[PDB]
Paper text:
The bacterial flagellar motor is a huge bidirectional rotary nanomachine that drives rotation of the flagellum for bacterial motility. The cytoplasmic C ring of the flagellar motor functions as the switch complex for the rotational direction switching from counterclockwise to clockwise. The basal body is made up of the LP ring, MS ring, C ring, rod and export apparatus. Here, we present two high-resolution cryo-electron microscopy structures of the C ring-containing flagellar basal body–hook complex from Salmonella Typhimurium, which are in the default counterclockwise state and in a constitutively active CheY mutant-induced clockwise state, respectively.
The hook functions as a joint that connects the motor to the filament, which acts as a propeller to propel bacteria for swimming in liquid medium and swarming on solid surface. In the intact C ring-containing basal body–hook complexes, there is one more peptide loop L3, which consists of the residues G310–P322 of FliF and is also extended from the β-collar region of the MS ring, bound in a hydrophobic groove that is formed by the α2–α3 linking loop of FliE6 with the D0 and DC domains of FlgC1 and FlgC6 on the surface of the rod.
Residue numbers in the entry:
A (entry chain Q): 3 to 62, 78 to 136
B (entry chain U): 3 to 54, 83 to 136
C (entry chain E): 4 to 256
D (entry chain D): 1 to 89
E (entry chain F): 37 to 243
F (entry chain J): 37 to 245
G (entry chain G): 36 to 244
H (entry chain I), I (entry chain H): 36 to 243
The structure:
Amino acid sequence: DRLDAALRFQQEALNLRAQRQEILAANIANADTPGYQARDIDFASELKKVMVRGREETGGVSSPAVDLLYRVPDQPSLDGNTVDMDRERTQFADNSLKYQMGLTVLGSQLKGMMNVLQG
Amino acid sequence: DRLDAALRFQQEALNLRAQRQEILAANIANADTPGYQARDIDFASELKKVMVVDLLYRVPDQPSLDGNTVDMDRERTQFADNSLKYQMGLTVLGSQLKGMMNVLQG
Amino acid sequence: VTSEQWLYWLHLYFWPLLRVLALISTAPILSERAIPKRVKLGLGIMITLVIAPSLPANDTPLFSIAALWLAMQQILIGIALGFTMQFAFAAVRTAGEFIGLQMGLSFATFVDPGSHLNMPVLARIMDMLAMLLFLTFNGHLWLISLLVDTFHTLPIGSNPVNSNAFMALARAGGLIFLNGLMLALPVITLLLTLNLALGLLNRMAPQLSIFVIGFPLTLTVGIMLMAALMPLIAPFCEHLFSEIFNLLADIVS
Amino acid sequence: MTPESVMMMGTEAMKVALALAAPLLLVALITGLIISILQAATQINEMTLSFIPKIVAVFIAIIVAGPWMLNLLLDYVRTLFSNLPYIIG
Amino acid sequence: SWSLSVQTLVFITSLTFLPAILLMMTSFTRIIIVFGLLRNALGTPSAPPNQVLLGLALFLTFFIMSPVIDKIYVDAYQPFSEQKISMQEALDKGAQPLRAFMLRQTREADLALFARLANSGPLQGPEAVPMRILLPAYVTSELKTAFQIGFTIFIPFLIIDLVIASVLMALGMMMVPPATIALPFKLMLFVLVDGWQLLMGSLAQSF
Amino acid sequence: SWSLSVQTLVFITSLTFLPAILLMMTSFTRIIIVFGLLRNALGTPSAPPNQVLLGLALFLTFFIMSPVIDKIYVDAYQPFSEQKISMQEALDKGAQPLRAFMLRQTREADLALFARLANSGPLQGPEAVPMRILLPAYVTSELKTAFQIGFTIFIPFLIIDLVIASVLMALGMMMVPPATIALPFKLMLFVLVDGWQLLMGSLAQSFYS
Amino acid sequence: QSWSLSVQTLVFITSLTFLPAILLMMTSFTRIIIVFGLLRNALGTPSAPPNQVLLGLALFLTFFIMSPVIDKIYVDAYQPFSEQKISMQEALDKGAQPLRAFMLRQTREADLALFARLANSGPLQGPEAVPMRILLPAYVTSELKTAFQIGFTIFIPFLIIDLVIASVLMALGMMMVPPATIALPFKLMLFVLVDGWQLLMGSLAQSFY
Amino acid sequence: QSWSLSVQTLVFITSLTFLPAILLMMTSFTRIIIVFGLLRNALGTPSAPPNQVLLGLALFLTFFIMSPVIDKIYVDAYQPFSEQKISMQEALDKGAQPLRAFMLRQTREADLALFARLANSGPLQGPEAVPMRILLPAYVTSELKTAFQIGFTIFIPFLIIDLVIASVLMALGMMMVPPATIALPFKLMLFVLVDGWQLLMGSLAQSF
Amino acid sequence: QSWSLSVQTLVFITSLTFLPAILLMMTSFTRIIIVFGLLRNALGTPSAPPNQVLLGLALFLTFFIMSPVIDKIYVDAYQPFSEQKISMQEALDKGAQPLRAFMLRQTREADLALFARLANSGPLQGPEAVPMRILLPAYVTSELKTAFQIGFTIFIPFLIIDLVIASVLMALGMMMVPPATIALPFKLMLFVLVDGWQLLMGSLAQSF
Amino acid sequence: VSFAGQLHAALDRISDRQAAARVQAEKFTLGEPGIALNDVMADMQKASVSMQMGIQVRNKLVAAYQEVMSMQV
Amino acid sequence: GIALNDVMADMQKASVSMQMGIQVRNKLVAAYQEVMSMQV
Amino acid sequence: SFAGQLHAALDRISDRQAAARVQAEKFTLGEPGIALNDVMADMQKASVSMQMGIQVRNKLVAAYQEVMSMQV
Amino acid sequence: TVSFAGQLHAALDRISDRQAAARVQAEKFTLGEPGIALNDVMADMQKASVSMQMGIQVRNKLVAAYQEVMSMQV
Amino acid sequence: TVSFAGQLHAALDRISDRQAAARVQAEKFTLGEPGIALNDVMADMQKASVSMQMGIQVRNKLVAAYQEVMSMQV
Amino acid sequence: TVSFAGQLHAALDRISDRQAAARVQAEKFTLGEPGIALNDVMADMQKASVSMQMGIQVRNKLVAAYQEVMSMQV
């Protein structure tokens, strides 16, 4: 209980990082599909929501209970998709580094605990 | 050895790709020899034979006057394809060896 | 897929392992230092592997004071079982040491109590004879079976506990003495008579007796007496084991 | 294996111990009794002169009967170790 | 509330001092010394094994601490779950029954000596005695109590030994050692009166 | 069959449990306990520097388990090495001779107890006993046999001390320690009656009987 | 001039290993436990209070005795260390002085002179200039001698009791009665009625002053 | 035919793990250490010389006793192997010979016969047919028996002193004294006036 | 010829590993430790001075006794090495000489002869050329013999005290009064009055 | 059904995935129609990830077993 | 299905909890053996 | 006294850990003014302090066990 | 009649002949002898490396098991 | 009269001096001092690390020797 | 006449000569002395490292074995 609660914030943040990267990869894959609005999630609000109330799924075809918001387009396009590649690749790299940061923090905490349980 | 049986297929494919690469480059080099026939091997049949070489003449497309049947475009495409497949075989064999290694490392 | 929920398996395999290993480290013959530690650990692990899947798994986290209370409960149960079993061998050792002390085997204790000079060799003889008898009567299998059975009576989950029950185990401390006398009452009595006889010899011409004629005679008489008395311990051995076992069954619940 | 066998081997063991210890103890007892009755006859009483001949007598006892004890005990141990794998349970 | 890893470190560190807690804080020393003296009384220093005496003292200690354990459970074990009180404050609240017990079992002279050994002048009240002054005083009081109980146990066995020796001397025997004769009579007296159960009852009454 | 990477992984992992196989499935356990008990008996708790006893026990176990190892090699290791039997079947084929040795020596009472503790159905013949029942039954039988052997071993070395103490007490030397006198005599006995050849042969017969 | 943080941490953790050595050879502990080791012999019960009880009681008594020295070390040396006004080298130099004075006041001059002569040291102007290599073993020697003096003096009343009881037993013709078992309860009486433990600890604490 | 250098390095560095086992089971270390432990037990004090001193002294004695065998191995195996004149396996086979002779010279016949019986050996023939896996346990058993034979007769003079002192003390009348307490200084006196250490080393060396 | 720096530090750490063996078998630690143990046994107090106290006392006494040898090693061997004047090999060779001389001063010629004859060493002219492998075991044996001599001699006054108290008790008829209980306080008094600790340490130092 | 059964199932699944990827790669190298290089490369990637997962599980499991066998009894 | 993120996190916890249980039991067993190795 | 100093040291170490954890938590939410290098440096400093505490505990426990194992 | 020493010798031989075969193939390819291909040289070298890693890991496991068995007390 | 405490103090002072010199040079280089080069800073830091590691290892060996000697039974 | 200390000294000296030779070769190459090739310099440096690591492993095994032999209870 105590150990589960202490490691729950970073674990949930890392899971939300994984889901956000899945969404960003879906946006990158559909970058040339005509009529596809780019989707993204508000990381902070959804992270607080998942902590107060546990993770939930729409079904389980299954998917998370996250709110898929639409990204504001930069410039218009005749085909009708709002996937701007610069934004997609910047968010992808930023999410990558933040996921690596979460892995580093969680691994440091778990070693910081094995060190104690080490006699 | 069991280690040979796992890596036999990729090693034989890599060696066959190298041999066919040499044959295609020989076809390119002898493009100007009058009376030279363009030779090639059937990769799949020879791979069966080695896993379980004979040179086959290429069917000419255009009739030249000096008897040379080497076509530039066909063999250039085949040469590029063989280079790509040699790289793919190297990648697959390296991945298998690296997996066998990380199984042991510890 | 590829779940392999680890916490469920850990909580299912941990507490039965704690109780089995707590019994192992204290139960006679299974707790003797001659066994390598890894053999004992493996026996506990295998017994838990056999038993645990049938039991209802607990879900209390290992990182809680409830886990500490559970561990204390398992340790208490195991050590109580092992010690209640050990009481019988304590009684046999007491009877043997007293027969040996009436032999005059270690006279230095009467003059220097606890002076690093004591050899209860008869106590050791009858202790190892009692261990052999316990091995013959398959008492250890019973111990393992009762360790398993105390679950149905007292499940892993934290349950409330009683009091005078502990006294019972402590009051079992009387048996070691009581039954001990029951093993020494015949032979010592005749030895007593022999000593009385020696007294009659000392009522004659003063000195010139005892410490010169009494010791060898009483030593030989004790030797042959209790050599003849050896066949007697086995019914008393079974009586002791039955007493310990049904006291355990009555009080553990 | 049977408890009868266990008690039989224990009894035989301790009778072997009795046979090993009986000559020395009996010799010491006889020497002590003889010295005591001589003291009573002569009206002499010191608790130390009975301790002197006892040591000499008991030490001579090993001279005379020592080989017999050593041969008996070795035979007992040899037979016990040889019959060990047939009384296993 | 401080860090979980620090809590784990402190908990495992405090687990090491468990023999110290058993000996210095509980009554285990008293029962163990009483058992040792009683064994010395009967004339047989190896009749019950040291292991058995230690385990019997452990069971007696567990029973006689059961009220204090219950008070700890009420004041510390339960509210730590409901989180009305927790952490070091709850630890101190749970340790409070141990003080009360150790104040009950400690003499005033030992506490006075250990206070004047620490220059603690303004120690006026009796429920605010620090642990540093309370612990060794409690141990010394336990030693004195155990020695007194051991002497009380010694009295009847000494009487029996003296009586046996006197009858041997009066009957004319001057060489027979009285210990050999008196040992079985000591045992038959100990068993017949059922010495063990009354001894444990008195120890429980002795608090 | 498994991929070669999986086979190598399984082989390397299974190489870890060798001490467990030696201790819980082999003759080593009742080949040691006897040595420890005998060392406790002679009064020299160090004497044969352990390592010496461990090496002797290892050689004895190797000499004793030879037919079982031979049967495993001829039935399981040889077909597996010749690519006739898969890796996941060589283990099953080789676990049978070891299981049979584990039975030839495992008592009944233990088998009945551990058949009852698992809530398993009736076992009309020994061919229905799984390894989950035979393992701890064999372990308990080996422990009991080792302790029986050691406890009948202990008797003469205590007999000698008894007679030594009695002889010392006959002459009134009540303040002479008997252990110091008895230790050279116990060593003399263990020298005379081929202390080790008889014990070695008795243990080896105790396995093959 | 200050040491680096890594070197300071290394030195601190290395010096943490010498805690039992410092406690035995520099504090009061050596005089206390030794006396206890003799007191349990005087009472006739080698078992006595358990070993751990006596060790912990000695530890608490030692802490109470060295409370002034510990306070002086905390004030003069460690407080500037925590408040950053001193280095580790200067703290080590300054904090030892009160402990050196405490060791010197209980050090016999003869032992100190012996260890000087044995180290071939030059003329020491005054107590303040005595090296620690000379003060440590001399303090340990004087500590042992003082502990033996206290123990022998303690051995007196129990000897009185044993002699009186033996004389009473022999004057009545009860020659065959071992007086140790009879006199043990009276030794316990003497230790109980006079409050032996509290008196002894008070005497030890006053002796160190 | 020769092994590759990588294989040679692997085998060489793996074989160093059996160095304590070789020293204990195969050399003279076992007998000397057992005799030394028995002598402390016989001195009346169980730990007078620390285990470290006895272990180092036994190591030096073992080296001095085995120096001729080491020289023979160096001449036969180490030197021609290091000069790259023989292979590793053949060097090991050649170097096993003097050690085999040393082990045989101190091996009881009954031990070898028993361990050949347990190893199914049938027509053995020349003393030069005993395999290493049969010779080694027989050598260990013979060494244990010989060490016990030496120890139980090392015990004799101290038992003589103990019995003489106890008999004199009790016959004189003082039967309440502990004889061992008075006897220990006399055991030390006997050990130092005989030159017990020097003579014991001489006897242990001559035993081979 | 000078070892490279990495080899030098490898040698230094490997030599630091062997420190307890050097302390026990090359210095005066062993003799002092044996005498202290025998003295503790002689007073009838088997555990009065804790082992750590006696070990620390023996270590300090050994340091004081070996201070001249350490000073000679520093001045002659270590100081030039620390100033890069000489290499590690020659520094070690120069540092061996004072320690050997000290060990030769405290060895017995008979033990040296025994170990020389056992090791089949050729005739050695004078004490100048004696190998360390020969000198070390001989020095250890001589130290053991000397320590036993000192302990046996020390055992005498306590034996006198025990005998006189036992005789005084026996002449009074007190047949069942053990003399150890009366002798222990008087042993403590005797050792205190003669200033036993400092006198014995001074005697041990003077014998070196 | 049991822990050993679950481990055997995991090993069989991982080996089956690796063999499927290898067989598809050999089929592509053979020249048979319909097999795309994209699928071959992605399946090899997935097989490598699964192998690494199995290796990590084995490493931990061995570490836990070593920890338990160090437990004092 | 369950992803590596959850599998690895629960795997690590379980390892941590098992190590904690082992260490606490070792402390308890050491304390018990120290108590029983006493001398009364 | 000594227990007070130990309590103060433990409190300082736990305050280190709590500050590092809170800073990392705030940075995870995207709060401005907290930089990654500061977070990593604080995490490493907290780890170093905790390791120092563990080592001190180990030395103290070993010293206590060695002291309590003496033969009076 | 199985032999563990014989089995270890056979395994060490297998590794050593694999390494020697790869080395000789590299020898001939460096010397310029026709018929030897560079990819075959590299593949054989990597196979020898894998075999030696096999041997090293088995050595580690065997040494650890032996040390843990021999560190036990009877 | 050579004392071991003096030698240990000298070694600790040398390690501390090397570490302090490396730290000071790195601090000066960070502050933009002209006459200091990066390669020298890194090499000095590595040398200080090597010296401190040597000190740690010597301390470990000394502590092991002391704990072995003080664990005797005299 | 075989002395193990002599063989240890010989091996240690041989390692030292290899290291010194590699160091001097690198020294000379840096000073631009004609006749020295970079590939041979690196090869000899790696051989020196291999020899030193072999010495380290041998020392580790010997020290471990000595500590296991020297800690037995006699």
